[PDB]
Amino acid sequence: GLFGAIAGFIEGGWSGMIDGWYGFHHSNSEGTGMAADQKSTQEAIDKITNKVNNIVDKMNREFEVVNHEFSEVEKRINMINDKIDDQIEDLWAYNAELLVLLENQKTLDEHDSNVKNLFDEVKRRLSTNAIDAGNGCFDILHKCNNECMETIKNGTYNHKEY
Amino acid sequence: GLFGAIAGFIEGGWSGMIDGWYGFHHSNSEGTGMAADQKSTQEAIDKITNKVNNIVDKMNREFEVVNHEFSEVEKRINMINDKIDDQIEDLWAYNAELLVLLENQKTLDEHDSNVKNLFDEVKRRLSTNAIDAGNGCFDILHKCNNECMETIKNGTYNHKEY
Amino acid sequence: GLFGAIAGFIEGGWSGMIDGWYGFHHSNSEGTGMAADQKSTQEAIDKITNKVNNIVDKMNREFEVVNHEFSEVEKRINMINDKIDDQIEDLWAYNAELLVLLENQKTLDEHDSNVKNLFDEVKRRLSTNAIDAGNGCFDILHKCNNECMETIKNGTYNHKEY
Amino acid sequence: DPDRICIGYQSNNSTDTVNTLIEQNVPVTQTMELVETEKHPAYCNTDLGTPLELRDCKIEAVIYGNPKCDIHLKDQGWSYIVERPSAPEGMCYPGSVENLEELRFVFSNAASYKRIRLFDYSRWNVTSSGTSKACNASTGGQAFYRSINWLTKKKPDTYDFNEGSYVNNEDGDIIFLWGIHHPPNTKEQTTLYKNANTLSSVTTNTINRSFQPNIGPRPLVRGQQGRMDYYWGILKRGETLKIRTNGNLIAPEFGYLLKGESHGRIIQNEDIPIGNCHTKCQTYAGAINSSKPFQNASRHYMGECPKYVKKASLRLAVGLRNTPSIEP
Amino acid sequence: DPDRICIGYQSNNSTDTVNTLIEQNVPVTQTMELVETEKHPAYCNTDLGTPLELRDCKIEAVIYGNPKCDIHLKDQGWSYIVERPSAPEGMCYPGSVENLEELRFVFSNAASYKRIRLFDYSRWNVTSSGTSKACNASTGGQAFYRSINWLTKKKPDTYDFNEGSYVNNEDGDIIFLWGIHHPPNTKEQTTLYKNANTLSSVTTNTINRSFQPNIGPRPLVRGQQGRMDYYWGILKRGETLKIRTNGNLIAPEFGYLLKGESHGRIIQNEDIPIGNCHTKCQTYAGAINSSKPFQNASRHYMGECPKYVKKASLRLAVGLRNTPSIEP
Amino acid sequence: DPDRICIGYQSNNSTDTVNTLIEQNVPVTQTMELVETEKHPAYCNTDLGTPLELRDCKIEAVIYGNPKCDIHLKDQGWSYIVERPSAPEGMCYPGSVENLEELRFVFSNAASYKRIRLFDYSRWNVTSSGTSKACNASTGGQAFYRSINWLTKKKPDTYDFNEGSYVNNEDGDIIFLWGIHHPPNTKEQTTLYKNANTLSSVTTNTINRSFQPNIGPRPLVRGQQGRMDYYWGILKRGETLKIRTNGNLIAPEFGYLLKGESHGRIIQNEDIPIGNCHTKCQTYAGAINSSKPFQNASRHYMGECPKYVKKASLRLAVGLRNTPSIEP
Ligand SMILES: *[C@@H]1O[C@H](CO[C@@H]2O[C@@H](C)[C@@H](O)[C@@H](O)[C@@H]2O)[C@@H](O[C@@H]2O[C@H](CO)[C@@H](O[C@@H]3O[C@H](CO[C@H]4O[C@H](CO)[C@@H](O)[C@H](O)[C@@H]4O)[C@@H](O)[C@H](O[C@H]4O[C@H](CO)[C@@H](O)[C@H](O)[C@@H]4O)[C@@H]3O)[C@H](O)[C@H]2NC(C)=O)[C@H](O)[C@H]1NC(C)=O
Ligand SMILES: *[C@@H]1O[C@H](CO[C@@H]2O[C@@H](C)[C@@H](O)[C@@H](O)[C@@H]2O)[C@@H](O[C@@H]2O[C@H](CO)[C@@H](O[C@@H]3O[C@H](CO[C@H]4O[C@H](CO)[C@@H](O)[C@H](O)[C@@H]4O)[C@@H](O)[C@H](O[C@H]4O[C@H](CO)[C@@H](O)[C@H](O)[C@@H]4O)[C@@H]3O)[C@H](O)[C@H]2NC(C)=O)[C@H](O)[C@H]1NC(C)=O
Ligand SMILES: *[C@@H]1O[C@H](CO[C@@H]2O[C@@H](C)[C@@H](O)[C@@H](O)[C@@H]2O)[C@@H](O[C@@H]2O[C@H](CO)[C@@H](O[C@@H]3O[C@H](CO[C@H]4O[C@H](CO)[C@@H](O)[C@H](O)[C@@H]4O)[C@@H](O)[C@H](O[C@H]4O[C@H](CO)[C@@H](O)[C@H](O)[C@@H]4O)[C@@H]3O)[C@H](O)[C@H]2NC(C)=O)[C@H](O)[C@H]1NC(C)=O
């Protein structure tokens, strides 16, 4: 994808992550954990919610096609009326189809960006105290207990301590 | 944002930077400086100028609604004329609203990209001679006077000298 | 550009690369090679092919303007018919022009993304075994024969071997 | 051995796929369908009320009062009209309605009507309430339109210039109706109306119309070589309708006091039944109950309806690209 | 201690916000408003000239020359027409103009007119310049239309077939006007026109029309049970207009030589005044002076105007996301 | 000295440039033009057949059978009609066709016609096949319309009420045509038709029309002060056409049995020739052979055509930004 994270440097998703789109796995001496990151997840939810509400609002403006009857000596007017209804319907078909193809492209790329940004956010916070494995994982060069781990996840980790 | 620089790894803007969107702060033995980068700033100005001129050009093509009068036995034609004016106006309302929502999304992301690219441009030029602080700042591992600083800013810095 | 690779950290293209958009140059003890990367190239071909086919499909829906004749006492209807044809043609002119300007912007950025992703893909696979030169080139810290080179290109390179 | 932290994203068992500009059938974790394809194939009530179903009679047959349509003589209201194409009864006596489309429009765009008596022709100096085999009642006997009255000469060879006034003192505009009978022979003209050429005038505050008969044999239609031209007008609040004839006038008897505004639709459909249902969205292919932005039911609808698209499906990505899962 | 270089971007005190597809009220450093909401609420001059304001008279009253509209008898030009709905004077003698909408269209689409005398009825074999209480002049006395002439019989019970020719040798097409008077009684028909049934023919190179009167009592309108049908035609450059009547013709006296093309608008507005201003963009809600692509004034405009949108605001991001400032 | 691997992209000698929303004239390695600007400036055959070119005669001249248009009397079919504006022959005897636009529409929308004889006027009680200097044949002698027949009185001052029937037993609907002659004098009316006022009725199962002459001198057109009003109707499958006249009727002789559906176009073009070519896309500016989505030839086309845009060029980027090449 555009940002190279989803189906990219992180090769696959986690089937265990049900309550969120993006999150963390950790392993230390005290054991193992996997949980959604609620901040990055909720930011993404707000954005797609805004997009959906905008798509619904821009497609629900008042519109009506009253069918009309014409005499056998009103063939030109009958054809003109049919042209209006066909050509306006045709322009709305373009708008609806193109908007879904365009926004589906962006939505999937926006998710890819969200994953890359979360990864980059952790990489900078860890700085020289961690080795990049190149699969979305960091090997921490010091002992990092559950307190240290939560400090990385919620973004209060100060690399100068270690 | 999409590229993770603005309100991202660089947490806030500079109130002092008035004559440009993107620029540099430096500190060395000779003191302190902050100035806009005119090249990256002028490239961005040209792009938004092109966008605005395109938006104005695509919305200023000749258009006219002559009001019409109809007899009491021309009710069907009267309704058909009203339908044309309502439904074309409705399609233009979609175009105008959607274009502003779409281009506002891209403009803000394009600025984010411009900041990230400037940062990356400096990071590569400095190479192994500087430590990344993770806030858009580089600590240079050698003495870097005003001559050295201007050489980084205007992009003639050769890292093999140091 | 948006992703900073094309006319960016890789300053120019290769005139020799005819059968592909993206590819590799290598130099070792056994000599020199330059070839397109068929996987990244073919992925890009599929995407632009899909885009072009979508653009052609969304513009080829059935459309027809039958010219009409009107009496000297049908001036209002004549003007209404002319308005329909002018204003629908005007909305299609907007759609065609805007779609080309929008998709040309994205196509060039999508290519830029494809180059950056290929570079990043190699950088991660090489890991600590190579030095980044900052021009799209890697200096490998161990001897890397044609077998080693093809292993980097086709993505089976294990950095722990060296 | 070293402590480790990893960034990951959701994979799931979703089979949902979307199309993008650059990619077909991309698997994604969460989607939403934007096209409503479910509907109730019936003609339901709306907030404007119940549809008027015309199984037996076209609208002009009801207005002019074709004597097979007496079920519709009652004061009535509607949200829209369902006119069955198979409805056999139109104008029973051969002839055309001038501006028929505009009459059906103004009638159908109203919310209801009251039948108002404009004239009583029992007190007139003519034989009134003439009948025809062309216009049989439902009970079998020969009859005529209920809204217009066939005036012929008084039995002792007399048809003078008879005239009457009606003043619209009702709370709205009235549709009034009349006909001009054209006999096939000059013999029938004199045996019905006495005068060989007649002047029939229908006038109001704004309208000024007069009619002479056009004698000559027309092709046989429903057993008649004679023909009627049917006419209509609108008498506005406070306006006076004046009629004057010495023969050939099928004179206005009952007008229609129009009230309010319906959806102003005449649906020409055979096989979709009227339903005992209420809907926010009534399309011509049935009722829709949906918050989805689009529907593929019909381009013709009334109420608050999703936009019409001729497409099976428009699936919108909500979640991210669905990938085969890896172990954390 | 180490020498440092930092990349940064602009923050400022801008309160401007924009909407994106994914985000409401995003603060940004520089924006531009695309909708013009300022206008001058007046009807101004354009490059096509000054609007013709009709406070007292509707267009048909000016064309037919209602004798309360003598201020408009002068040769005149306009860029567009402002017809005040309250304008009381229309057709003074009761009756309808055939194809009134098409007449108002062709007249209003011209840039100017010259009144051309088609006929002098002083030399005719009739009593010309008939008057009516229905058509009072502004000075109070009973008068008639200035453009059409009420011809009655010559005093010693005489109205023969009178005919005349006019040849259009002017530099353009001429609107010509006439009426057919329909008396309420057969008594009035003979006391005005002598003949109980008349033939009035109006013919040109292309048009062939004839008219007989339709006697019968119409409802009283402005003190008249009589009625006139009003007609119009276009006499092209070089065409001959021929009129022939033995009664009931309200004969053409003055035609209108149309020149050029205006904005071809008739604005039906009460409360927006005519202004002593010049504008590039005149909307029906007032004049606009803007380079902005959109306006929310009116969908009806003339000149070079921003596109109409029913929206208060469409703010476009120019600068970047405005963030709370940090110290370099 | 160290072993090296580099990522690169294509540069080439392409001079192709595209416009983006943010950038003009961007060089790119591969592009495609979306607007077809090539066409064959001729009117070609389509899958619906060959265009009917009318160099000499307008459509109404062919239908009514102007005697200078005898080349078109033959049964014919077309895909569309090319009517040269310079075509001199219309209605030869001065007068207008009622609903001319609707006649040209219904005729041109058919795929072909057969000329059907409705009546033989040799057996009628009138002098048939009247001629005029206004309607000269191509060979020079005075003639008349082939489709309608000028009936005058039988030589010993006789014109009774003559009537006839035609039954449409053909496989389709028939256009039937007639005229009403209006003499300039009451003298000519009696020297042609004997009766000073006539009744001419044209009736079918659905249509009921009658006509009286309107005597009076019209301006001289092609040597005639007389005038004809031209009329038309559609006789549906199985319907009976009945005509009845005692003078002034230019009676229906030949009707037109319409079959099928063409492109239903009448192109008014002078200088584009009919071509011996076949095309999938025929525009009004010539034939197009293209898979490109757009064309700038004409907004008027038939067949399977690219969408019309008034633009020289819309170049789509396929490849990437073309940069000056660097050595690997
Ligand atoms: C309006 O109603 C008219 C009157 O209708 C009748 O009276 C009312 C009250 C009801 O009772 C209704 O049911 C009645 O029909 C109606 O006119 C009628 O139309 C019908 C159908 O066209 C006519 O029926 C035909 O009659 C002839 C003649 O019948 C006599 O002679 C024969 C031979 O000597 C005897 O066998 C009979 O017993 C009679 O003495 C028949 O020849 C014909 O039979 C043929 O056709 C039928 C199908 O219609 C076949 O089944 C047979 O096998 C034959 O092939 C019909 O029976 C009826 O004469 C006529 N009556 C009157 C008084 O006019 C009118 O049509 C209605 N108007 C409209 C527009 O519908
Ligand atoms: C066209 O103009 C017509 C003539 O107009 C007059 O002459 C011109 C030159 C001007 O001077 C103009 O100002 C004049 O009015 C016009 O016809 C006129 O219409 C008016 C209004 O309808 C008539 O006025 C009414 O007259 C009757 C009768 O008046 C006589 O008898 C009574 C009782 O014995 C006396 O009191 C009078 O002095 C007279 O001797 C009145 O009954 C009536 O009064 C009632 O109505 C008014 C309001 O209109 C109230 O103020 C009163 O209280 C009463 O309730 C009016 O005064 C006038 O008779 C009539 N004149 C003629 C010659 O026809 C015509 O209407 C104009 N056409 C159109 C279409 O407008
Ligand atoms: C329908 O056809 C009508 C008949 O046409 C003729 O017969 C057919 C079979 C052909 O042979 C055809 O070629 C014939 O023309 C047609 O009516 C004719 O119209 C023409 C043209 O308007 C008339 O020609 C003019 O005739 C007068 C009179 O000529 C006589 O007198 C003069 C003077 O004494 C002599 O010099 C002649 O020899 C004759 O004896 C001429 O004055 C006039 O000449 C002037 O105009 C021409 C140009 O037209 C100039 O070249 C000259 O210099 C002069 O300035 C014409 O020659 C013809 O008289 C007339 N014939 C009849 C029998 O009516 C009709 O117009 C056609 N209908 C329509 C609608 O087109």
Ligand SMILES: *[C@@H]1O[C@H](CO)[C@@H](O[C@@H]2O[C@H](CO)[C@@H](O)[C@H](O)[C@H]2NC(C)=O)[C@H](O)[C@H]1NC(C)=O
């Ligand atoms: C039927 O005939 C009677 C008598 O002719 C009409 O009544 C007359 O109507 C006129 C005009 O309104 C009056 O002037 C007479 O005074 C009336 N005479 C009588 C004796 O009442 C009556 O109007 C006619 N009916 C119709 C419908 O025209």
Ligand SMILES: *[C@@H]1O[C@H](CO)[C@@H](O[C@@H]2O[C@H](CO)[C@@H](O)[C@H](O)[C@H]2NC(C)=O)[C@H](O)[C@H]1NC(C)=O
């Ligand atoms: C249209 O669909 C709505 C939404 O599903 C239906 O409303 C629900 O009906 C059930 C059963 O009465 C209730 O338990 C829910 O609380 C209702 N939801 C809301 C938002 O009211 C509605 O019944 C359907 N309408 C028709 C006419 O069938």
Ligand SMILES: *[C@@H]1O[C@H](CO)[C@@H](O[C@@H]2O[C@H](CO)[C@@H](O)[C@H](O)[C@H]2NC(C)=O)[C@H](O)[C@H]1NC(C)=O
């Ligand atoms: C609206 O969309 C639905 C879904 O595509 C259509 O229903 C399908 O129609 C096809 C073609 O006739 C059938 O073979 C399938 O069995 C239907 N599938 C489903 C899932 O229902 C429907 O016909 C479309 N059109 C209308 C007018 O409703």
Ligand SMILES: *[C@@H]1O[C@H](CO)[C@@H](O[C@@H]2O[C@H](CO)[C@@H](O)[C@H](O)[C@H]2NC(C)=O)[C@H](O)[C@H]1NC(C)=O
């Ligand atoms: C008024 O009457 C006179 C006399 O009847 C008309 O003049 C005559 O007109 C005819 C036809 O144009 C000529 O043939 C006569 O020679 C004329 N006679 C005289 C004595 O001039 C005059 O045309 C009539 N006016 C109108 C308007 O019809």
Ligand SMILES: *[C@@H]1O[C@H](CO)[C@@H](O[C@@H]2O[C@H](CO)[C@@H](O)[C@H](O)[C@H]2NC(C)=O)[C@H](O)[C@H]1NC(C)=O
């Ligand atoms: C419309 O707005 C324009 C632009 O503001 C006005 O033009 C300016 O007017 C002032 C005062 O005359 C000048 O100092 C500027 O130089 C003008 N600018 C330009 C570009 O000409 C203009 O006056 C306004 N028009 C009306 C009719 O009020």
Ligand SMILES: *[C@@H]1O[C@H](CO)[C@@H](O[C@@H]2O[C@H](CO)[C@@H](O)[C@H](O)[C@H]2NC(C)=O)[C@H](O)[C@H]1NC(C)=O
């Ligand atoms: C055009 O847009 C302007 C700005 O929204 C409208 O002016 C506002 O209208 C509201 C609603 O009536 C008022 O309460 C505000 O006081 C107005 N605000 C401003 C800033 O002017 C205007 O009404 C819109 N419509 C038209 C026809 O001009």
Ligand SMILES: *[C@@H]1O[C@H](CO)[C@@H](O[C@@H]2O[C@H](CO)[C@@H](O)[C@H](O)[C@H]2NC(C)=O)[C@H](O)[C@H]1NC(C)=O
């Ligand atoms: C020409 O005249 C003859 C004789 O008047 C007409 O033939 C008569 O037509 C009537 C009505 O159809 C019949 O009743 C007679 O029996 C017929 N008489 C004869 C002697 O045949 C004929 O119809 C007339 N032609 C036209 C066209 O009207």
Ligand SMILES: *[C@@H]1O[C@H](CO)[C@@H](O[C@@H]2O[C@H](CO)[C@@H](O)[C@H](O)[C@H]2NC(C)=O)[C@H](O)[C@H]1NC(C)=O
């Ligand atoms: C329209 O263009 C097509 C495509 O170039 C032409 O078809 C080709 O014609 C040549 C010569 O006959 C053949 O060698 C190719 O095989 C054809 N291609 C296809 C896809 O059929 C076609 O001849 C042109 N049509 C006209 C009428 O000129």
Ligand SMILES: *[C@@H]1O[C@H](CO)[C@@H](O[C@@H]2O[C@H](CO)[C@@H](O)[C@H](O)[C@H]2NC(C)=O)[C@H](O)[C@H]1NC(C)=O
């Ligand atoms: C369609 O597009 C083509 C290409 O722009 C037009 O052809 C050019 O027209 C210009 C302006 O008249 C000429 O000066 C050039 O010589 C033409 N260039 C080429 C490359 O042909 C063409 O006129 C456009 N319009 C139509 C109706 O075909």
Ligand SMILES: *[C@@H]1O[C@H](CO)[C@@H](O)[C@H](O)[C@H]1NC(C)=O
């Ligand atoms: C999801 O699919 C996987 C792979 O086939 C399977 O192992 C698992 O049981 C499925 N989850 C369910 C049924 O909840």
Ligand SMILES: *[C@@H]1O[C@H](CO)[C@@H](O)[C@H](O)[C@H]1NC(C)=O
């Ligand atoms: C901008 O806002 C800041 C923060 O409130 C304030 O300190 C500063 O004075 C403002 N700038 C001005 C008034 O120029």
Ligand SMILES: *[C@@H]1O[C@H](CO)[C@@H](O)[C@H](O)[C@H]1NC(C)=O
């Ligand atoms: C492409 O352009 C380059 C630079 O001018 C030139 O050296 C080369 O010969 C060109 N390639 C050709 C002609 O194939």
